[PDB]
Design an enzyme around this catalytic site. Structure first.
Site, PDB file in Angstrom:
ATOM      1  N   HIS A  82     130.001 -47.361  46.755  1.00 45.27           N
ATOM      2  CA  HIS A  82     130.521 -46.115  47.383  1.00 45.27           C
ATOM      3  C   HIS A  82     131.097 -45.166  46.134  1.00 45.27           C
ATOM      4  CE1 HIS A  82     131.942 -43.944  50.898  1.00 45.27           C
ATOM      5  NE2 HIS A  82     131.434 -44.944  51.617  1.00 45.27           N
ATOM      6  N   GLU A 115     132.527 -53.152  54.042  1.00 41.24           N
ATOM      7  CA  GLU A 115     132.946 -53.297  52.362  1.00 41.24           C
ATOM      8  C   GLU A 115     134.515 -53.193  51.953  1.00 41.24           C
ATOM      9  OE1 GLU A 115     130.712 -49.216  52.216  1.00 41.24           O
ATOM     10  OE2 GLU A 115     132.587 -48.437  51.184  1.00 41.24           O
ATOM     11  N   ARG A 145     128.096 -43.894  55.603  1.00 45.01           N
ATOM     12  CA  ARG A 145     128.901 -44.926  56.146  1.00 45.01           C
ATOM     13  C   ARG A 145     128.238 -46.022  56.519  1.00 45.01           C
ATOM     14  NH1 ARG A 145     133.440 -42.647  58.215  1.00 45.01           N
ATOM     15  NH2 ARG A 145     134.431 -44.819  57.967  1.00 45.01           N
ATOM     16  N   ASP A 173     124.967 -47.083  49.333  1.00 49.90           N
ATOM     17  CA  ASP A 173     126.108 -46.660  48.236  1.00 49.90           C
ATOM     18  C   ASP A 173     127.431 -47.234  49.119  1.00 49.90           C
ATOM     19  OD1 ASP A 173     127.556 -45.468  46.040  1.00 49.90           O
ATOM     20  OD2 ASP A 173     128.158 -44.163  47.636  1.00 49.90           O
TER      21      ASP A 173
HETATM   22  N1  LIG Z   1     128.913 -42.445  49.828  1.00 51.04           N
HETATM   23  C1  LIG Z   1     129.854 -41.444  49.497  1.00 51.04           C
HETATM   24  O1  LIG Z   1     130.453 -41.278  48.349  1.00 51.04           O
HETATM   25  C2  LIG Z   1     130.317 -40.625  50.416  1.00 51.04           C
HETATM   26  C3  LIG Z   1     131.650 -39.909  50.264  1.00 51.04           C
HETATM   27  C4  LIG Z   1     132.167 -38.990  51.397  1.00 51.04           C
HETATM   28  C5  LIG Z   1     131.587 -38.904  52.501  1.00 51.04           C
HETATM   29  N2  LIG Z   1     130.071 -39.444  52.728  1.00 51.04           N
HETATM   30  C6  LIG Z   1     129.200 -39.240  53.898  1.00 51.04           C
HETATM   31  O2  LIG Z   1     128.118 -38.520  53.655  1.00 51.04           O
HETATM   32  C7  LIG Z   1     127.708 -38.310  54.995  1.00 51.04           C
HETATM   33  C8  LIG Z   1     126.992 -36.833  54.977  1.00 51.04           C
HETATM   34  O3  LIG Z   1     127.980 -35.976  55.045  1.00 51.04           O
HETATM   35  P1  LIG Z   1     127.750 -34.488  56.028  1.00 51.04           P
HETATM   36  O4  LIG Z   1     128.505 -33.464  55.032  1.00 51.04           O
HETATM   37  O5  LIG Z   1     126.207 -34.373  56.137  1.00 51.04           O
HETATM   38  O6  LIG Z   1     128.893 -34.756  56.741  1.00 51.04           O
HETATM   39  P2  LIG Z   1     129.464 -33.483  57.700  1.00 51.04           P
HETATM   40  O7  LIG Z   1     130.389 -33.872  58.803  1.00 51.04           O
HETATM   41  O8  LIG Z   1     129.374 -32.288  57.002  1.00 51.04           O
HETATM   42  O9  LIG Z   1     128.083 -33.351  58.841  1.00 51.04           O
HETATM   43  C9  LIG Z   1     127.069 -34.199  59.225  1.00 51.04           C
HETATM   44  C10 LIG Z   1     126.199 -33.909  60.201  1.00 51.04           C
HETATM   45  O10 LIG Z   1     125.677 -35.148  61.164  1.00 51.04           O
HETATM   46  C11 LIG Z   1     125.155 -34.348  62.182  1.00 51.04           C
HETATM   47  N3  LIG Z   1     125.375 -35.442  63.266  1.00 51.04           N
HETATM   48  C12 LIG Z   1     126.625 -35.663  64.264  1.00 51.04           C
HETATM   49  N4  LIG Z   1     126.406 -36.436  65.276  1.00 51.04           N
HETATM   50  C13 LIG Z   1     125.073 -37.047  64.961  1.00 51.04           C
HETATM   51  C14 LIG Z   1     124.116 -37.896  65.711  1.00 51.04           C
HETATM   52  N5  LIG Z   1     124.702 -38.523  66.857  1.00 51.04           N
HETATM   53  N6  LIG Z   1     122.980 -38.270  65.141  1.00 51.04           N
HETATM   54  C15 LIG Z   1     122.356 -37.508  64.226  1.00 51.04           C
HETATM   55  N7  LIG Z   1     123.262 -36.651  63.589  1.00 51.04           N
HETATM   56  C16 LIG Z   1     124.548 -36.280  63.921  1.00 51.04           C
HETATM   57  C17 LIG Z   1     125.983 -33.218  62.590  1.00 51.04           C
HETATM   58  O11 LIG Z   1     125.548 -32.168  63.074  1.00 51.04           O
HETATM   59  C18 LIG Z   1     126.478 -32.735  61.053  1.00 51.04           C
HETATM   60  O12 LIG Z   1     126.087 -31.831  60.846  1.00 51.04           O
HETATM   61  C19 LIG Z   1     128.912 -38.346  56.054  1.00 51.04           C
HETATM   62  O13 LIG Z   1     128.692 -39.228  56.636  1.00 51.04           O
HETATM   63  C20 LIG Z   1     129.967 -38.556  54.839  1.00 51.04           C
HETATM   64  O14 LIG Z   1     130.898 -39.621  55.664  1.00 51.04           O
HETATM   65  C21 LIG Z   1     129.679 -40.307  51.554  1.00 51.04           C
END
Ligand SMILES: NC(=O)c1ccc[n+]([C@@H]2O[C@H](COP(=O)([O-])OP(=O)(O)OC[C@H]3O[C@@H](n4cnc5c(N)ncnc54)[C@H](O)[C@@H]3O)[C@@H](O)[C@H]2O)c1
Ligand SMILES: NC(=O)c1ccc[n+]([C@@H]2O[C@H](COP(=O)([O-])OP(=O)(O)OC[C@H]3O[C@@H](n4cnc5c(N)ncnc54)[C@H](O)[C@@H]3O)[C@@H](O)[C@H]2O)c1
Ligand SMILES: NC(=O)c1ccc[n+]([C@@H]2O[C@H](COP(=O)([O-])OP(=O)(O)OC[C@H]3O[C@@H](n4cnc5c(N)ncnc54)[C@H](O)[C@@H]3O)[C@@H](O)[C@H]2O)c1
Ligand SMILES: NC(=O)c1ccc[n+]([C@@H]2O[C@H](COP(=O)([O-])OP(=O)(O)OC[C@H]3O[C@@H](n4cnc5c(N)ncnc54)[C@H](O)[C@@H]3O)[C@@H](O)[C@H]2O)c1
Lengths: 330, 330, 330, 330
Positions: free
Chosen positions: B295, B264, B235, B259
């Site tokens: 993205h 954005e 994000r 990404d």
């Molecule tokens: N660019 C893209 O195309 C796209 C699309 C969808 C999602 N995403 C993003 O990719 C990222 C990774 O997804 P995911 O499955 O790992 O998310 P998830 O929600 O499955 O879990 C994210 C992890 O971050 C950890 N976390 C929570 N609080 C934290 C903190 N203060 N400091 C550090 N870590 C912490 C949590 O333990 C969790 O395990 C997400 O942020 C999601 O929004 C990107």
């Protein structure tokens, strides 16, 4: 002792102290490569490491080396073509080389280029440069584990490409003239045509021979899947550049990663003006679905380190009359 | 049965027929997002499948769903910020979503961008444009198995990045606030600060909360290695874009692949004129050690299909009275 | 054409038709190995494949082969010691062999034995045979990714062991006299002592030389971690069996997997009576934390297939006066 | 603070001090399971940590917990069948558990037993005992990358089996009633029947429900390959033990590795006399192509530590008013 190092790269210079310490030897770097002019510079030395720009043609050099007690030509490369073995034998100078410096470095450049083109990041950028930040279907990608990889040739490097891709979950097919049991866990041998037909990503790993000059030409691009991605981190002369460019323009394939090109020696490794760069390169360079790197798959710390140390190791052994791994002399 | 579909992508359109056969249901396709304007097209439908552009403000839509026997609302996406769950409750509309469509889609974007920038392919291209086809030491690379990866957050996606990188031989370190034994074959847990200090490649996988906004700012770039690569396929708001640009400009980090980017919303997923593109993007896009994709890490066939086929499947179940796997609260 | 196959195994017999078809040749199997008695049997043949029980000592055989037009000795093994090269050169018979038949087969036996002992399944069984179905702490195990593996020697086989273990997430250290860039992704070179000190699992991959006879003896077991697991799928003579047995009994190490043993040739590959099996084997056999297999790491379909086909391939080439991969003759 | 611990294992005891320092709390250790008999030892405790031998029948224990301010009950294990959740509710005892302590512990037992039986190490031993040290074809093996793995159910553990096997090069097929995109790099989904037909190694990872009891019986062994290996590190009642024994005896399958067995409750985790061990175990244990371990797949350091440190951590949180990760319903 003291080993002369000719034609040192900027990157090799950074290694010298470490290398001196490890090998307990002194390195004497000379900025040009070895030639009749500056051979008088190895007088104080027991061996010699070379990176020849161009052929060692004259024998005034090959003699004066013998005079000073030098018993070896230590090459920091794989290529031996600059070495007049006629004269080598004549002056009793054996020749060593560095065939395998880092297969993974080339392999990783290959995989890397393949990934980027598969994800279409350059096309996206081209879209973005014009104000388009959408996700059109034409730029949809796919997970690498849904892809079939095709290797032409294997070798150390192809072997490595397969290891990697197979580790990401992709299916890997290879054509080859030799059977090697080591790679079976990572790929499945098939013949040339099935590999061109069924591969989503194809990468070249064939030595340049008269039999393989241009082995990828108009015929092959047509046989390939229209959304396939060719990678050539092997030898430029394996691919018919014009057939490539055309296949690219007519969309008969989808992308290409090239670390080599036919007639590259004219501009690769050089600084040049616009009027000095050929037109086929300029065409490929202007294509968002094409990567061209200047033959730098090899270019990692490990390659560079090994190029020095493997060549030094052998060269010292032959200074002691001990035995050297990588001869090419009898 | 019949399930209505709102605002599909042109690549969502491509799968429709296949989906109908595979599920043996119809898909009444409506181009625009659900509204009081088009809500009545659902009359002859069993369940509904949603990609809201915007907040679902009106109430007369939620009534009319429940008057048509619509027992659930199937988000094809992961967001919920336009569902008024209060209104959902009165009308007994259970609310599903898709949180996990393809973790590896995104993991692979993150790996792909990391390898490209590690191989410094864009810096090479920037040189080749200016006539330079050499291998200066400032563009020397390294094998992935010599690098350390640092993940801030793990999750489904992070876990996938760790698998791939550790499968290529890299040391993977990860910071997370929750322990998962599952991922220990692939990484080693560490403190936030040791991850930043020790990682050559850093990839963010932390949800955007109020407490993680600008989690990576000036302080943290200061703490990174100066040849570090920062990857953000999470994000945009996790990173302070000005801090990043300054860090790049000053060579306090080596590269970045993003990404996603703070602010954005205004131009990602759109066609726009130069004047409408912000100046912080223009700077980044100009840097040959930077990658910006719009993205699109999610964007594979597999994802697009799952966005549809996972929502459909919970929507059909809930219509048949059965269990949905991805019901959602608040 | 027609190639005589001497000393065929039960397993080689099952391959004959496939092999005949693939190579478009006829195989003539003879139940004993080649000797002055039955050499009159290759008269109708163009080449010869051998699995010698014991030395080809007399020259009546080496002559009569030449008489019948045979120009090669095609060995279906790696070992050449039975081949009087004095006579070979004399009769112009070159010699081929099969060095690499399947590294993964040996490698997988090694890993397999290691896994089983780590999980203590035999000790558990010993506990169970006496009525104990508990989980005592003494039989607690651990995930393989918490383990350090130590390779003495690498080679094709050790290389493979590392690939596998590293793929399961374990840390892999190796001592070796040659540096090989190929294996860097899968292991880290260290010296002999650090490897004996820090390894939880140690596996041998050293050729038998006078310098390595007994290289694992009382001194080494003492240096090893007390809960370590030694595996020797290399050569029995590398380990001091009595030092082993004692280290086992005093609990100075925890377990051992042995596919080889000193003085094995007396009973391996044989049917025998109690009074014919040595006492060191009987001791090791009675230990629940010990595996001994009768030198059958090699024994897979692929090994067997390759042993036939690689030896046939070369042997046919030399029947045509073409070129053969694996000579050992000049 | 102080957290009481009931009925620890002798290996649980070994970690105690380390746990106290790492958490900075005390652990009041009680050998026997919680009861009206020992409930009062909790008086001076904040939260509680449970390994119930048996049903927690009495109510006066649940009252007295809540009179001592005990706000939650922390199962160190995954089972719940002795918690009267009805009584928990009245006394406002929220109820946590540990469902995921080490999936790889168990996956690795399953892989380990599969490889041992594939290498047929016990059949070799059975021979060596009778004086036979040969390599008959009936004991020939194969490389793992030539086998197909079939998983019935996936889950956390199955997912781990798939990772490891596919990392060794095997084709992994899996049947499941729920789709998870995460596992697709490692396996391919298939129908139940095609998994049974096509798999060389079959491993069960299906919860024991009323609808899965004897899921593998006579019909299903009939459907398997006759050189198939069946691995059950899930729940004994998934397999019809008589069907299995008959299948083994008739050579309708090749081997089995069972960590769990119908009717095990009566002797697993106990010391017993011959007379108390059932006859279906005695048969299996006699077969050199069988492995029985006493439900010890879970038993690593990591698991034992997580059984304690995951319960503790949710028990301390719930005592501080915070969020527990593994609260449980019904
Ligand atoms: N660019 C893209 O195309 C796209 C699309 C969808 C999602 N995403 C993003 O990719 C990222 C990774 O997804 P995911 O499955 O790992 O998310 P998830 O929600 O499955 O879990 C994210 C992890 O971050 C950890 N976390 C929570 N609080 C934290 C903190 N203060 N400091 C550090 N870590 C912490 C949590 O333990 C969790 O395990 C997400 O942020 C999601 O929004 C990107
Ligand atoms: N761009 C770079 O940085 C760079 C650097 C070094 C080498 N290379 C090239 O990459 C190639 C791969 O390197 P390597 O060490 O793995 O290979 P290698 O030279 O060790 O082995 C070559 C292999 O190619 C196969 N082969 C042989 N003849 C063939 C034919 N007629 N058709 C198809 N396949 C055939 C065989 O498997 C052989 O083992 C080299 O041959 C070389 O041309 C590129
Ligand atoms: N049990 C079996 O079924 C079986 C079958 C074939 C071979 N083997 C044995 O297993 C070994 C491994 O096979 P391979 O093909 O991988 O090996 P290889 O013979 O191809 O290479 C041997 C390697 O061992 C290392 N080495 C050499 N000298 C050493 C020393 N003094 N100390 C420590 N290490 C040294 C080097 O790395 C060398 O590359 C063989 O050497 C052989 O003895 C066993
Ligand atoms: N031997 C041991 O030491 C030990 C210890 C604890 C647990 N286990 C067992 O290991 C097994 C694997 O655990 P897991 O994490 O995969 O379980 P899980 O509960 O995480 O998930 C099991 C999977 O089985 C699938 N499934 C459900 N119904 C099915 C059906 N009718 N047919 C086929 N598949 C179905 C589900 O989709 C689920 O994904 C479990 O049965 C567990 O009880 C063994």
């Amino acid at each position: 002792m003291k080993i002369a190092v000719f034609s040192p790269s900027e990157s090799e210079r950074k290694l010298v102290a470490a290398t001196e310490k490890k090998f307990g030897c002194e390195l004497k770097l000379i900025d040009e490569s070895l030639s009749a002019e500056n051979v008088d510079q190895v007088a104080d030395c027991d061996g010699v490491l070379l990176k020849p720009l161009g052929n060692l043609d004259d024998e005034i050099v090959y003699k004066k080396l013998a005079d000073y007690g030098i018993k070896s030509i230590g090459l920091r490369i794989v290529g031996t073509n600059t070495i007049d073995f006629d004269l080598a034998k004549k002056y009793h100078l054996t020749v060593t080389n560095v065939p395998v410096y880092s297969p993974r470095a080339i392999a990783e450049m290959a995989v890397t280029q393949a990934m980027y083109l598969n994800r279409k990041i350059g096309e996206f950028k081209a879209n973005m440069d014009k104000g388009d930040f959408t996700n059109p279907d034409s730029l949809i990608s796919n997970e690498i584990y849904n892809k079939t990889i095709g290797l032409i040739g294997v070798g150390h490097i192809g072997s490595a490409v397969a290891q990697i891709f197979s580790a990401m979950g992709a299916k890997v097919l290879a054509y080859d003239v030799i059977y090697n049991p080591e790679v079976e866990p990572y790929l499945t041998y098939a013949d040339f045509d099935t590999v061109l037909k069924e591969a989503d990503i194809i990468s070249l790993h064939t030595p340049l021979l008269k039999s393989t000059e241009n082995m990828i030409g108009k015929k092959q691009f047509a046989e390939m899947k229209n959304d396939a991605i060719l990678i050539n981190a092997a030898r430029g002369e394996l691919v018919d550049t014009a057939a490539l460019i055309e296949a690219l323009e007519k969309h008969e394939i989808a992308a290409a990663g090239l670390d080599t090109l036919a007639h590259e020696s004219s501009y690769f490794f050089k600084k040049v003006d616009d009027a000095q760069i050929p037109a086929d390169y300029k065409k490929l360079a202007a294509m968002p679905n094409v990567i061209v790197t200047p033959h730098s798959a090899y270019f990692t710390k490990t390659s560079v380190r090994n190029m020095i140390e493997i060549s030094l190791r052998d060269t010292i052994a032959l200074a002691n009359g001990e035995r050297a791994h990588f001869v090419v002399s009898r």
